[PDB]
Amino acid sequence: MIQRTPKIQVYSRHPAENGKSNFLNCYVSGFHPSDIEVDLLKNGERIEKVEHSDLSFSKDWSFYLLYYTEFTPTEKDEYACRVNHVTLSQPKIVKWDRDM
Amino acid sequence: LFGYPVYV
Amino acid sequence: GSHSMRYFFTSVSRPGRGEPRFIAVGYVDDTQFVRFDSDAASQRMEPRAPWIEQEGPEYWDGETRKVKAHSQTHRVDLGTLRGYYNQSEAGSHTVQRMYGCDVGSDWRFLRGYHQYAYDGKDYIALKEDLRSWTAADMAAQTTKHKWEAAHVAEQLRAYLEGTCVEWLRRYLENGKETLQRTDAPKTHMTHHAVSDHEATLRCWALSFYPAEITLTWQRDGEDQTQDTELVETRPAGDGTFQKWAAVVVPSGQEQRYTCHVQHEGLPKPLTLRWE
C-alpha cells in the first residue's frame, strides 16, 4: 500500500527578531498514511505546549499538518523539528534556520 | 454539507 | 475573481483500538472555516474562522448532524471496502472523500467535484459532466454500478449546482473582509556566502493571501527554472502564506539576476534585484 514521505519545513511565522514574540512552525506535508509523530525541540528537549492544525489533504490525497508553538527567539536558543512516520527508518530532525 | 447518505 | 468551497473527510480504521478516527474540515478558497474530530470532546462541528462563528444554533446543530452522518457512512465504508479487497481485519486502512464547487469571477456555478480515495489511491470520482463516474479498480466498479442504479449522481449534481453554490456566496458576503481580501506579499532578499566564488540569493514572499503565487528568478531576463530552488508554499499560522526561491550566483554576477513575483494582491508584478 501507498506510503509517501513527509516533506518538512521548520520556520517562524514572523521574521525572527531576538526578544520579540513569535510562533515556531513545523509544516509536514505530502505524506501518507496519516499517522505521523511531530515534535518541536528547544535545545534538544521536547516542547510541551505544541498545537497543530486539523488534518487535511491536497488534490493528490497526500496529507498536511501545521505544528506550532509560541516562542521568543534569542541569540543562543536552538530549535528543531523531530518527525517520525512509517516511511522513515528513524526520526528525522530538521534544525530551524532563521533564513529558511 | 451534502445531506444525503452515500455508501460505496 | 473565482472562488471555491470544499469539504475534506478522512476516516482511518483502528483495528482493535476502538472506532475508526474521523476528521472533517471545510474551506472557502484557502481559508478553513469548520472542523469535526471524532476523537474530540465536543462531538460537534466547530468554527475555525471568525466569520462563521456567528451563524446561530440552527446552523451548528444542522452541520453537526450532517457531519455525524458522514462519519457513520464512512465507518460502514471501511467495512465494505475491506470486503471488496478481501483484506485482513488487523489492517489499518484509510478512506478519504472530497467534494465541493467552484464559481467564476461572475460568481456563477463553474465546476463541481465529488471523489473518494482508498489507502491513498483514487477509487471513484464524479466526472466533470457530473452525470457519469470514473472508476479505476475492479472493486470501484461495484461501487460505480451501485451509484448509477441508485441515481447518486443526480442528487450530487443538484447539490453541487445549487445548495453548494448558494452557501459559497453567502459566506463570501458574510465573510467579505476575510474571504474577499487580498494580502500582497511582503518581499525581501538575503545574501549568504556559500564559498569564495559563489553566493546564494534567496527571494522571499511573506504574509500573502491567497496561496496562489508565482515566484521565479531570471539571469539576463532568461528562465532559470532548472537552476532554482523553490520551497513549497507554506502556512504561517495566521491565515497567510510564505514562499521562497533561491539561486546560486557566481561572484560578481548579482546584477544579472532578477526575482519576479506575481500575486493578485500586487497592483503589478515585481522585479526585484540584489543591489
Write a brief caption for the model.
It is classed as immune system. With 100 residues, chain A is mostly beta strands.
CATH class of the largest domain in chain C, named: Alpha Beta
Query: How helix-rich are the residues of chain B, as a percent range?
Result: under 10%
Biggest β-sheet of chain B, characterized? none
Shape of chain B: elongated
Give the termini distance of chain B in whole angstroms: 18 Å
CATH architecture classification of the largest domain in chain C: 2-Layer Sandwich
Radius of gyration of chain C: 23 Å
Number of strands of chain C: 17
Global geometry of chain C: globular
- Specify the oligomeric state: heterotrimer
Q: What fold name stands as the CATH topology of the largest domain in chain C?
A: Murine Class I Major Histocompatibility Complex, H2-DB, Chain A, domain 1
PDB class: immune system
Keywords: Immunoglobulin fold, immune system
Assembly: trimeric
Entry title: crystal structure of HLA-A*0201/octameric TAX peptide complex
Structural write-up:
The complex is a heterotrimer of chains A (100), B (8) and C (275). With 100 residues, chain A is mostly beta strands. Chain A has one domain (1-100): Sandwich (Immunoglobulin-like), CATH 2.60.40. In chain A, 0% of the residues lie in helices and 47% in strands. Chain A has strands at residues 7-12, 22-31, 37-42, 45-46, 51-52, 56-57, 63-71, 79-84, 92-95. Helix content of chain B is 0%, strand content 0%. The radius of gyration of chain B is 7 Å and the shape is elongated. Chain C has 275 residues and is α+β, with helices and mostly antiparallel strands. Chain C folds into 2 domains: 1-181, MHC class I-like antigen recognition-like (Murine Class I Major Histocompatibility Complex, H2-DB, Chain A, domain 1); 182-270, Immunoglobulins (Immunoglobulin-like), CATH 2.60.40. Chain C contains 5 helices and 17 strands. Chain C has helices spanning 57-84, 139-149, 152-161, 163-174, 176-179; strands at residues 3-12, 21-28, 31-37, 46-47, 94-103, 109-118, 121-126, 133-135, 186-193, 198-208, 214-219, 222-223, 229-230, 234-235, 241-250, 257-262, 270-273. In chain C, the strands form 3 sheets. In chain C, strands 4-3-2-1-5-6-7-8 form an 8-stranded antiparallel sheet. In chain C, strands 9, 10, 13, 14 and 15 form a 5-stranded antiparallel sheet that branches. In chain C, strands 12-11-16-17 form a 4-stranded antiparallel sheet, with no helix packed on it. In chain C, strand 9 (186-193) and strand 10 (198-208) form a beta hairpin. Chains in contact: A-C, B-C. At the A-C interface, strand 1, strand 2, strand 6 and strand 7 of A face strand 1, strand 2, strand 3, strand 5 and strand 14 of C. Chain C: GO terms for molecular function: beta-2-microglobulin binding; CD8 receptor binding; peptide antigen binding; RNA binding; signaling receptor binding; T cell receptor binding; TAP binding; TAP complex binding. Chain C: Its main location: membrane. Chain C: Glycans are attached at residue 86.
